[PDB]
């Protein structure tokens, strides 16, 4: 569902974005991502899911997209 | 930066199967050729690979 | 009179290269001509311009001023890739470690200034700065203080009587207003794009009969602060027109009957432009079929304004044969050759089919491995008939690595890995791993697939997995489950529309912590065991050798915002004997589009789904393979899966509930009538689309003993259908393709629910 607008940097990349999806249970979230010049794009994330009856409140997330 | 193998050199290109030539049976004749072609023997003693010293000539003076 | 040379410390050039044109040649007496000659030589070489040469005795100095050289670059730029500027500066005559004279300052200055002008930033100031470093060196200090955007203001038109300006713009690229909520096109200035806009507008006129239409001018004004640009266009709408036959004429090597048949038309009908385009291209296509390589189609009109009718001429010619001799490749440094061949539609040693090579290039690009694919058709020396295409490609890295870590309140410490490798060893194959576990799930899998098991397109794919759901929401359904297994498959196109895939497989499941409810109990009773139905510490194992087979389809006109075509589907299974749960099932889907209008803005939509699943040896199909229905996917209004029967919990007499349980008999259909936006302006009224709808649905058991449980809503009733109706939007957001939906189910049954609102994302299925 949720992606952020155009954000990046010169030798870096700032990104601001929220999170949902059509999809596993419901996926409510928000986070960011940072890119190194060549390969790695990654950031941090907070989440909120819906496990069956009730809803999952918390989830933190690491990321590492190491293209190669 | 995925190639260091053929950089320090190795005796890989060595011991490649030397070249023989076909020979035409009767009637027909093998086609004439030209182009990419080994130079004549011109024997020397320039060693192979690590047995040779790829080093910059001295001064040059 | 002078013989000695002078060169006061050349320090960078050869001395003979400076004595080339010196008039102090040996044995050559020197005069005022010597002064003229040495001045002209020192200036012609242009390396250095200092000189002090006169008629003075035996000595004669020819001095030199050495402002070079420079090796440094200073910026400067703020929102442009510096290395691109480096390239452009190379294209001007300068580069690191090289001589440089101030005649280049204004050159590069205005070069980059006009560059920024082209980009639209019509305000900038590039400062050339050099600082003497020892005896030759300087720095290259460029600062870039520039304007901002110079954005558009309005795009008006004069003389458009037939239509209005709004719908005309629409179509355009350089939109006027970027709404805060329907961003589909964003506004800048691209001098080059104005041309494309002009052309698409002219075409838009030429596809209605306005033959004599022509633009006649164009102004791009500018406000005196370089913030808002204006743009205007003038036209002459002329009138409509008609046709009278088509008059193909030329040398066609025959080759006429199919031509004429390929060109028939209804007289007295409105001239069309795009139809003429399609027809001439189809002539080109037939020629390519017969073998010729480079045809030609030219259509000048021949107008009778008085008759409001034009007799359209067509003059064509074939050309020659142009055989292809050897199709090479350039670039595939880590991707095996045999790949880049099988993706082709032009076999070496044949006649060259232009469209074939282009369809190739298209395919190749679509393969995804590469990033940049360009062609060529160079000719062989000597022969006038043979050529040999080559393909310039530059691949990019393919495989990827992932890693993530987390932890939650209702979720343990997260873990996440996997080596997604796309083009393994550049050998067509594909391989990846995955993994995730907080507390309740332990998903992991393995991937192996070869898209070319045969030389034709017959794919092949493997799979292994592990699945250990561990839910403990004490008493809803929460049947704890560990399960894993593997399977292989096939798949192969037949008509670039249809497809088949018939996979084998194997799966082993482990039920655990079952709860008391009759349906599952029934299944078990038919499985041989006899669980004491008053305690929920339960478990069960199984193994079955499955079998898959399916068939797909697509005929949609477009891929985005469909309007006409279809999408059918099918999938069935069967437990091969030797298994332990003899069952089988069949699904079925269908999408259908019919444009009730000829301008393709009023379309109906018809969806349907079906299903059936039954056991064989009096063994009910295991409940962990049951159908469902209800939700913003197939049956609007309700919640997800709300439809269908409900469990019956044993007492620890009986009772009921409302939590859905599903079953094995699905059926659902729907209808829609697309309709435009009757409110918003047509500046962007094409990027929102909606309809009305009136849906259906139903789900029921097949083995329910409807006799004993008469104090309960019967479930062998296959007729309990629940219908709904409403409207729903669809338009791309700054966030993603969204589909709002607000209906209100008029009908229902008991235990069901209603969910008035429906917010989804990208129902691009």
């Amino acid at each position: 569902c949720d992606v952020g607008k155009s954000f990046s940097g010169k030798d870096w990349k700032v990104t601001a974005r929220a999170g949902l999806g059509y999809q596993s249970r419901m996926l409510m979230s928000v986070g960011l991502n940072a890119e190194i010049r060549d390969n790695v794009r990654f950031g941090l994330e907070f989440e909120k899911s819906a496990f069956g009856k009730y809803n999952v409140d918390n989830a933190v997330n690491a990321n590492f997209r190491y293209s190669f | 930066s995925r190639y260091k193998r053929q950089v320090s050199g190795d005796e890989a290109y060595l011991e490649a199967a030397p070249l023989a030539e076909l020979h035409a049976p009767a009637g027909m004749i093998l086609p004439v050729t030209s182009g990419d072609y080994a130079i004549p023997v011109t024997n020397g003693s320039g060693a192979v690979g690590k047995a040779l010293d790829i080093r910059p000539p001295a001064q040059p003076l | 009179v002078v013989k000695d040379i002078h060169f006061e410390g050349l320090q960078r050039v050869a001395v003979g290269a400076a004595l080339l044109s010196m008039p102090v040649r040996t044995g050559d007496t020197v005069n005022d001509e010597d002064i003229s000659n040495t001045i002209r030589a020192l200036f012609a070489t242009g390396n250095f311009e200092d000189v002090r040469v006169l008629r003075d005795g035996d000595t004669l100095l020819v001095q030199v001023k050495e402002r070079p050289t420079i090796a440094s670059i200073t910026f400067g730029n703020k929102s442009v890739k510096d290395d691109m500027l480096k390239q452009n500066l190379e294209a001007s005559g300068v580069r690191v470690g090289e001589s440089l004279d101030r005649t280049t300052i204004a050159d590069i200055e205005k070069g980059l200034e006009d560059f920024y002008y082209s980009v639209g930033k019509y305000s900038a100031s590039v400062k050339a700065v050099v600082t003497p470093l020892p005896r030759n060196r300087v720095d290259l200090k460029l600062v870039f203080q520039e304007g901002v955007s110079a954005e558009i203001q309005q795009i008006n038109i004069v003389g458009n009587h037939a239509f209005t300006t709004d719908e005309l713009i629409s179509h355009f690229q350089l939109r006027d207003e970027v709404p805060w909520w329907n961003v589909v096109g964003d506004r800048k200035y691209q001098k080059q794009k104005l041309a494309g806009d002009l052309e698409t507008l002219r075409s838009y006129y030429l596809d209605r009969g306005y033959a004599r239409f022509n633009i006649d001018s164009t102004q791009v004004s500018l406000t005196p602060d370089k913030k808002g640009i204006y743009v205007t266009v003038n036209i002459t709408e002329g009138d409509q027109y008609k046709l009278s036959g088509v008059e193909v004429s030329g040398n066609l090597a025959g080759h006429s009957a199919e031509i004429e048949q390929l060109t028939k038309i209804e007289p007295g009908e409105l001239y069309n432009g795009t139809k003429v385009t399609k027809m001439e291209d189809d002539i080109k296509k037939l020629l390519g079929r017969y073998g010729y390589a480079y045809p030609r189609v030219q259509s000048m009109p021949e107008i009778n304004d008085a008759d409001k009718t034009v007799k359209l001429r067509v003059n064509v010619d074939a050309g020659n044969r142009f055989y292809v001799r050897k199709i090479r490749f350039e670039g595939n440094d880590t991707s095996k050759d045999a790949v880049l061949r099988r993706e082709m539609r032009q076999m070496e040693g044949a006649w060259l089919g232009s469209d074939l090579v282009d369809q190739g290039k298209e395919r190749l690009n679509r393969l995804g491995f590469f990033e940049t694919v360009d062609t060529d058709t160079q000719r062989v020396p000597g022969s006038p008939d043979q050529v040999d295409v080559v393909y310039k490609v530059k691949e990019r890295n393919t495989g990827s690595f992932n890693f993530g870590i987390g932890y939650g309140t209702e979720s343990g410490v997260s873990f996440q890995a996997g080596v997604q490798q796309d083009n393994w060893l550049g050998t067509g194959y594909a391989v990846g791993i995955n993994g995730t576990k907080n507390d309740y799930q332990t998903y992991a899998e393995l991937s192996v697939t070869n898209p070319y098991f045969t030389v034709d397109g017959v794919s092949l794919g493997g799979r292994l997995f592990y699945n250990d759901f561990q839910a403990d929401d004490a008493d809803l359904s929460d049947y704890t489950n560990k399960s894993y297994g593997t399977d292989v498959t096939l798949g192969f196109p037949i008509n670039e529309y249809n497809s088949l895939r018939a996979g084998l497989g194997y799966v082993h499941n482990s039920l655990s912590n079952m709860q008391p409810q009759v349906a599952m109990w029934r299944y078990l009773y038919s499985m041989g065991e006899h669980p004491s139905t008053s305690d929920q510490d339960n478990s069960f194992k199984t193994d079955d050798f499955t079998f898959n087979y399916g068939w797909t389809y697509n005929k949609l006109d477009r891929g985005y915002f469909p309007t006409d075509g279809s999408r059918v589907n099918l999938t069935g299974k069967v437990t091969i004997p030797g298994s332990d749960n003899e069952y089988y099932k069949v699904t079925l889907d269908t999408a259908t589009y019919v444009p009730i209008d000829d301008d393709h803005k009023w379309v109906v939509l018809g969806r349907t789904r079906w299903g059936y699943g039954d056991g064989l040896g009096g063994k009910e199909m295991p409940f962990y393979e049951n159908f469902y229905a209800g939700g913003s996917s197939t049956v609007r209004g309700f919640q997800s899966n709300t439809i269908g029967p409900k469990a019956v919990y044993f007492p620890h007499d009986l009772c009921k509930s409302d939590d859905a349980v599903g079953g094995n008999a699905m059926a659902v259909a729907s209808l829609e009538f697309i309709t435009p936006t009757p409110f918003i302006s047509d500046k962007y009224a094409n990027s929102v689309r909606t309809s009305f709808f009136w849906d259906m649905g139903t789900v029921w058991d097949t083995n329910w003993d409807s006799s004993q449980y008469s104090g309960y809503p019967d479930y062998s009733d296959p007729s309990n259908i629940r219908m709904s109706a409403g409207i729903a939007l669809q338009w791309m957001s700054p966030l993603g393709p969204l589909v709002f939906s607000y209906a209100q189910p008029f009908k229902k049954y008991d235990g069901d629910k209603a969910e008035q609102f429906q917010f989804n994302c990208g129902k691009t299925w």
Binding site: - | - | Y117, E146, Q153, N156, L222, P224, D225, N234
Partner: protein, 369 residues
């Protein structure tokens, strides 16, 4: 993001000082508006009565003193349902006889009736009529965006002739006004030249390339010269369409003294003094005879200014934030400053029979004392 702005800014506020008591009288508004679009629609005045306009909609008629309207006419049209197509008026209203004239941005030149507000007629034209419609002996000639200096007659609403001009590829929004002389008309162009046409037939006899224009063609360029030339004693003081100011002759129109100390918006003359706007707020002054600079103040630099107008010993100027920067006739101090509106000033004011007026962005009419 709010971090994408890089430009040479302006001076915030000039040196508050209120020797005089700058005062307003009444403030009526005639509906939005002018918006952001650059235009030339300035409000006019006739014998105790004024008439305003707007960008998209209507016109009105008001009293010089009480700000109470007289009537109101719109020029839109229903289209489908609840649409009401815009009218796009962008040519400053003027006055002659018992009528008005409006340059719209769709080749229409409406011409309304004074008393009631009815359409005497409406004549389609070439190009996009923008500039200030002027009257001259029943021939209300107007300029356009295609160089086509048309020449319309009032009673009929019919063309009389058409003298083509030139244009560069890219252009500043140059909308030179016309000028009358003995039956010969002199008008600015959009290339860097000025021509002189005789009215009765539409055939020019004389031309001169005074200056240059903007756009990859760097001479004094960023100058929003209302290229309106004025003439005294035949010797036309037609200043520079883009900055190389020059004085020229009636018949020949040859350079009297080219002093490139200009980059203009508009100007006036009073006997000896001339007042300018050097595209960079560099207000100055000079004598009729030739190159001099009695003074120059530029602390206003880079504030968006409007063309000035004489007012009983002071020059009045408008900023892009509603301020009236009253100035001594000579040097050069700021006799008065007064904030009036926060909408935005972009058009020109006007003075006649004491009655002073100006338009805002949207809530147009103010009645400066």
């Amino acid at each position: 993001f709010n971090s994408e702005e890089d430009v040479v800014k302006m001076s915030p506020l000039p040196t508050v000082e209120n020797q005089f008591t700058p005062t307003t009288a009444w403030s009526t508004s005639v509906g939005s508006g002018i918006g952001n679009f650059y235009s030339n629609l300035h409000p006019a005045l006739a014998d105790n009565v004024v008439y305003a306009a707007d960008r998209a909609g209507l016109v009105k008629a008001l009293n010089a003193d009480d700000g109470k309207e007289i009537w109101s006419v719109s020029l839109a049209e229903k289209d489908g349902w609840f649409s009401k197509e815009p009218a796009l008026l962008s040519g400053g209203v003027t006055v002659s006889g018992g009528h008005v004239y409006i340059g719209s941005e769709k080749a229409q030149v409406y011409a309304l009736n004074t008393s009631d507000g009815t359409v005497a007629w409406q004549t389609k034209v070439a190009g996009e009529a923008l500039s200030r419609p002027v009257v001259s002996d029943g021939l209300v000639l107007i300029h356009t965006s295609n160089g086509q200096l048309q020449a319309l007659n009032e009673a009929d609403g019919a063309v009389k002739w058409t003298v083509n001009l030139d244009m560069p590829s890219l252009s500043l929004r140059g909308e030179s006004a016309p000028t009358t002389a003995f039956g010969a008309a002199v008008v600015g162009g959009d290339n860097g030249r000025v021509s002189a046409v005789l009215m009765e037939q539409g055939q020019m006899i004389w031309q001169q390339r005074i200056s240059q224009a903007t756009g990859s063609t760097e001479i004094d360029r960023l100058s929003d010269v209302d290229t309106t030339p004025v003439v005294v004693n035949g010797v036309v003081f037609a200043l520079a369409y883009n900055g190389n100011l020059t004085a020229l002759d009636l018949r020949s129109g040859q350079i009297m003294w080219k002093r490139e100390l200009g980059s203009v918006n508009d100007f006036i003359v009073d006997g000896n003094r001339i007042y300018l706007v050097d595209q960079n707020d560099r207000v100055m002054a000079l004598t009729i005879d030739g190159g001099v600079t009695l003074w120059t103040q530029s602390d206003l630099l880079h504030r968006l200014l409007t063309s000035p107008v004489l007012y009983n010993g002071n020059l009045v100027v408008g900023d892009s934030e509603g301020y009236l920067h009253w100035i001594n006739v000579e040097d050069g101090r700021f006799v008065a400053q007064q904030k009036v509106d926060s909408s935005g000033f972009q058009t020109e004011p006007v003075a006649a029979d004491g009655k002073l007026l100006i338009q805002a962005k949207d809530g147009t009419v103010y009645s400066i004392t």
